Design a protein around this ligand. Structure first.
Ligand code: K
Ligand code: K
Ligand code: K
Ligand code: K
Lengths: 494, 495, 494, 495
């Protein structure tokens, strides 16, 4: 049938019997750094904790790491740990008396001539960007101090200098970050700080990396190389933040393990109505690729200080889910907000509402129709297992995958039931936290043996399903595992 | 194909070749009531002018009507004229000292006893709604003042009086609005002031009524009765504002000419996530029925006073279009905002982006898969005509329908091209302003003759698509007409 | 649904309510040359009369023509008139005493050296084919005297001469036709006799030509050129008789107006099981092209002298219909048989049985799915009209087409009801007799006017439908016609 | 895709890469009863040996059985052994002077009175069938002597005697066979000589019975009863020979293990064009049920005495395959013809041509579209396995089924590759010889162990596909088995 037919037969006041398939990423901040606070978040619905490396030293983040692992252990929970890189930046230079006041209607010259690095004035100051006047055009814009100060470029004065118009009052201070909307800029894939930070990330055993400002496939390869051999199993989620990213998404997807749609960042460069559509394209492309996609920024912002969001905000979360996002991310709302638990709980409810209003069969059919023939054995087995779920109406799907690969492959086909992955690696448990539908369960092969005939992982998988209330004796499950991940079975729960 | 495959093959940076199918309803007020501002709105992309009859007297609205018809005639435009009723209303009485401070954990007595109307205290105050004790039960909820004050009903004290638990802190002032979530509210379809508004409306030859707070099919019938014989051709668009209304959607739709999803009102009573889903359900049911649906309230609100809306707002509007809405409505943004024209231009842009990002073929198939076999001739002819537009890539669809019925029927099937409707009735032109994809063109039979063989109306329609830039010579159009209902199609080269 | 589902729900003893869509071509001979005989055939179910120009002079065929037109007129029937060309031949030379006896196991030399033209013996004789020993190989075969004498080529003796093995007793006589199975032979598209015959055909106003031995697209173009300007509206049906024909069918179809599958001819060269499959391919290709295809030879042969055929023969007729043939052709059975009327009647019954056992919706969907998008207006209109028939369950489809074009286009989409074509040309009436489903009705514009608003042709079309018992008042028809063939209507019969 | 699109893209001159899926049943007789000739037949492509029990004594058939098992063991082949019963029989009595000449327009009295058995005249003769006057009514028909003499019943003269109209000239001789078209014929399922044949059959461990002249489900049950406890695993294949049988096809199918379409017998009673359609209907119903169907009689008849058949005959055989038949049967062509081996080789060739010209995917879809949702596990597993063969292009499908049930279930879904069945039962090997696509391979559990984890049977099956030339290392196979019914699939690389 169809989404159209799903909508018209929907009873919006009947209870939802579905279980939450989407996953929530939370930013850790002052509101939420303690063991207790982190437990609250875990109980509320957090799957992944995001360290924002734009702020805070290594020891700040070490605290997040330690307290998160203490909390997760207490609760018997696998939580993903994500390092979100600062990324390259363009900074202003210095000012006399450490700052300057600008007024709506003033002109100010901005220059890449270093002679002005140390000596900025209301009238002229330095931006650390050698190709400034090859890059930014007249009528173009520059934003400074997290997008707060807006300058309209009036004209090119010389090869180092632009004349600008001040659109709003701001008091500008030493070495602020700059925005150059609409420009191919000459910045590296990773900064030197990024390099130190990724190194730290690898030493601390992070699960995934949110790579800032990704513009090309090669830049992703640079993050891969940075992480090096020792971090070859850390996932890279490339953050798409601008027109180049959106333009290069096919290659970036190929190179990455996943994508983050940074809506607010995109919205600096691109008309809002085109960010909406970019979000759709980017999400659909990841679905088709079977790679996790995370929707970030501008999510339930107003809930940072209010106990309830606007409907518009709620609708925007819903729609990311409808779009096909695995995950939705919270920023300030958990990092520094008044209601971190409540907002996470509320996200969970919204997700669940939208899940229930989606016809999953339609997306399954849609992904399926993208598949070229012949398929590889591994695609065939996973898409065939999902097809079996719909056909016999199974209430859970169990995959035995040590790396998580098949869990991701299954998920990509959008079964209308939960996916359980029995794995021998805790790392796989933490990394599956960004994959829709999935509950990872850890099989301890050191304790219980190698389980060559699978009997013990199947049984663990089934017990997990029973204990979360997905199945009871008499229900059907589909099980995917290796022979002596290419075997499927259809079983009754006993 | 599929929406998914449409998405992955989409380039957001290519120019858009499509022509806007969705329609914009604007509320007139002080920002936009002058002839000159109305011409601005029309040029900016208004199809329907909304007279909000909560506010303003008849004289004030007469100025709207006179100015609108002066403005529309100058620009040769057909503009829908809509009366939006005040409707029934639950308000509190007065408080001593002008208001009262209610803290959570407080209990308060609310009474429908007229003797307390003017002496509300922290202890006890008046609510105008006599069947209060009957329709709100213990465990039921009362929301006051745009839904910000929440009261749980603990018990009935007498027939006049309920004891309520205060859930949350709020300062409550003279005559604020009350809502009764979940309840069957026992107010009339039309207030007494609504009958006088309707009366004025029919006198002035309005095109449609936006009927407030519609909860049942029978209430739609009461609005139908109130317009009476004289007003029999005026479209009724039922406003769905609460739980009962959402629940009774099938009946209300069948009785109405179309639906308006009143999100702000819905959101007072219903949790926000269920408004999102409710909207989807309502729109999709209207889609199936081939009746216009209008998404209203909380659209681009911040743009009332700011030059820019938020991305979330823009997203909200776009998604109304994705859901399948024919129209989107502006309220304060045009009625009193600083950027009337700019907001309308911006809505048009959003609409057109979302249109371009939609796989129309998928909605065509979805609608078509729902028709029973065999089809009636008219249903086969209209769906066949829309299928032809896709198969030969025609660039407009021309429909000859004096009442507008076939144009609505063609728009149901979602062709990805414009729909021209040749009609002999001005009223139909104005009534079609709420139907997705349609541009009505008037055939003046008094000047050009009865056109028994349709040839003149067919040429008029082709000329219309030429003037508007939809087709040039060598393009294809698809034509639908009678030889009753439409029973013929043509496929033609534009000359 | 499907043919599979159609079969299982079929009630084989319930009456058939369908009307005969397939058409029957009859060969005219001694059994059937009189006015009376020809009337019998017309009443029995003949749509097309075939003159076989392999035998009989011009005056012989003039008699067929005259008597057929006399008969058709009496009965108020439009019958197609088809000239089937002799084609090029390879003849032997002469023999002393005008013949020679050969025995199973004898050797005989065959030569293209003309010195032997006049002087053939049991031991050596002439075949009029200069490239003989470049063409026929050892182990290859030659057949002489309508395929009766079989010679196996033992060896090449020199450049003019082959040594052969005699497989069967035959008494071989002056100037018999030869078969060279498995060979690209060097023969013209038309013979000089063919040229005279086509000329005669054009003077006598034939409707169509069955072009013998068509091997390439250019050869069809040669028949087109032969017929010339004066015969530019005569249809060419290319007869496929060998491997080259089957190999070149795409181009031959493109160039032709239709195809005849000459099964017996093909079966000389090609294994029987491959003729079965050739028949399928050739028929399907014509369907997809919207061009008539006729199944010929070896149809109900045994009914030439017996009052009933074998089941195998019956099944073979049925299957041509199932395959998708517009038409099935009778040869000796009507040309020289004992039961010309009965065999034609029996063909009609078989056709009708098979029609009723076919799921036409499946072929409609199948043709439809071949169509590239965009379609032209004319394809769109016809395929849309047929789609309407299924959708509102119309009981007839009426096209107004003076040339018959739209009738052929409609037919190609396989409606499950009869097609009526109102046309201003009697020639169109006669030519539509090879197109499945179609009843042509003649509108006399000289008598009744030009009917610019179509009212009179619609009314004539509807009356035709009523009078054949296809519709009654209250039924639906679909009508396709031109504006001021691009208008469709759906009407109720009054 | 579609059969149509498969046709137009087909090249008849390309070599065929497929392996024969259809099976050939051969009747043994004097041409082929020797060990040496049976080895010829096996090498030529016989899967099933048919003992025709209309003719020959037990000793004669014992020689068949002994020779067949000598021949099959030498070549290491599994050959189905089938008993085809004589069945009940309506014959005339004797005539004075050895026969009578009946001219059309003559009337004749036919009687079931035993006193006329030996004295038939032009006026009156005997037919052995006591309920004649009851089951043939005025207007009903009696066919005699392979259906060539047609009699219309005019009236019942007494309880013994019918007055008949002669439709057509014929010379009628001692004890010719009679048919009663349209009638419910009141003969037993099994004659007395049939019980002795069956008895012999079960003693000798035959694989299947071809049960003659089956008209009702209850008659199938009688054949089931006659094989009794000892013969409970012998397949019953019901022969459909007349109108009642065709009419009762749903019941007969449900009661049987499969069906044989007896065309010659059908054609005596039913007009030839309806036999063609009847065959389609029967085959398609067997297809849907997943039970084997065998097309028999009038196959390549002229090849009994000629080196070549006619194209029409070849066409007939090919179309049995297109219709969806699992098997085709040879009669006189092998039993007494001059070219036993050549006819079988030729059938194999025809079968394989027709196989190659079929779009198997279309039959897969057709079958699959008929399953109810939700499916049972076994149905989901088997259809899913066949789907995998198409999706990854596997080159054989391996099924572990001791009874053969899943192999039959897999063959229902029409994979376009061979099906290997690993079974622990020799009987299953022989029984699978009538199932489209299947090669059974025997797992000797006594020698190799019980194979609880299936690994040995999986390797055996892979080896079997290697020996047979279906796969090489690097190809894919699909595997089905239990962990009851089949509930697991694998997809594997051949090593
Ligand atoms: K960051
Ligand atoms: K209002
Ligand atoms: K000829
Ligand atoms: K027998």
């Amino acid at each position: 049938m169809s989404q159209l037919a799903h909508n018209v037969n929907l009873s919006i006041f009947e209870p939802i019997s579905h279980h939450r398939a989407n996953r929530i990423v939370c930013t850790i901040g002052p509101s939420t750094q303690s063991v207790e606070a982190l437990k609250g978040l875990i109980r509320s619905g957090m799957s992944v904790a995001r360290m924002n490396f734009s702020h805070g030293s290594h020891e700040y983040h070490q605290t997040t790491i330690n307290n998160l692992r203490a909390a997760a252990t207490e609760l018997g929970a696998h939580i993903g740990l994500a390092l979100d890189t600062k990324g390259p930046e363009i900074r202003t230079g210095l000012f006399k008396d450490g700052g300057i006041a600008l007024a709506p209607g003033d002109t100010v010259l901005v220059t890449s001539d270093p002679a002005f690095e140390k000596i900025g004035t209301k009238e002229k100051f330095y931006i650390e960007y050698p190709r400034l006047s090859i890059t930014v055009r007249p009528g173009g814009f520059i934003y400074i101090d997290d997008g707060v100060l807006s300058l309209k470029v009036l004209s090119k004065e010389d090869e180092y200098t632009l004349k600008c118009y001040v659109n709003n009052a701001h008091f500008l201070t030493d070495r602020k970050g700059c925005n150059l909307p609409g420009c191919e800029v000459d910045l590296p894939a990773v900064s030197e700080k990024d390099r130190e930070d990724l190194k730290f990330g690898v030493e601390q055993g992070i699960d995934m990396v949110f790579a800032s400002f990704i513009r090309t496939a090669e830049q992703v390869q640079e993050v891969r190389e940075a992480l090096g051999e020792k971090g070859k199993d850390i996932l890279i989620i490339s953050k798409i933040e601008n027109h180049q990213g959106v333009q290069n998404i096919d290659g970036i997807i190929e190179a990455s393990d996943g994508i983050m749609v940074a809506r607010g960042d995109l919205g600096v460069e691109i008309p809002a109505e085109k960010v909406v559509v970019a979000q759709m394209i980017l999400i659909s492309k990841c679905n088709v690729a079977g790679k996790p996609v995370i929707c970030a920024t501008q999510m339930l912002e107003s809930m940072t200080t209010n106990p309830r969001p606007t409907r518009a905000e709620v609708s925007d979360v819903a729609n990311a889910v409808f779009n096909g996002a695995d995950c939705v991310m919270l920023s300030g709302e958990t990092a520094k907000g008044k209601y971190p638990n409540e907002v996470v709980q509320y996200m969970a409810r919204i997700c669940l509402e939208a899940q229930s209003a989606t016809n999953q069969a339609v997306m399954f059919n849609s992904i399926k129709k993208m598949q070229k023939l012949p398929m590889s054995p591994e695609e065939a087995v996973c898409s065939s297992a999902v097809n079996s779920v719909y056909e016999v109406r199974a209430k859970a799907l169990l995959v035995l995958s040590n790396s998580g690969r098949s869990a991701r492959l299954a998920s990509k086909y959008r079964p209308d039931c939960p996916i359980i992955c029995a794995t021998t690696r805790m790392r796989t448990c933490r990394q599956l936290t960004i994959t829709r539908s999935v509950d990872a369960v850890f099989y301890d092969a050191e304790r219980y043996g190698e389980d060559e005939n699978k009997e013990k992982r199947v049984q663990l998988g089934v017990d997990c399903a029973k204990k979360k209330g997905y199945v009871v004796p008499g229900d059907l499950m589909v099980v995917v595992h290796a022979d002596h991940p290419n075997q499927t079975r259809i079983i009754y729960v006993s």
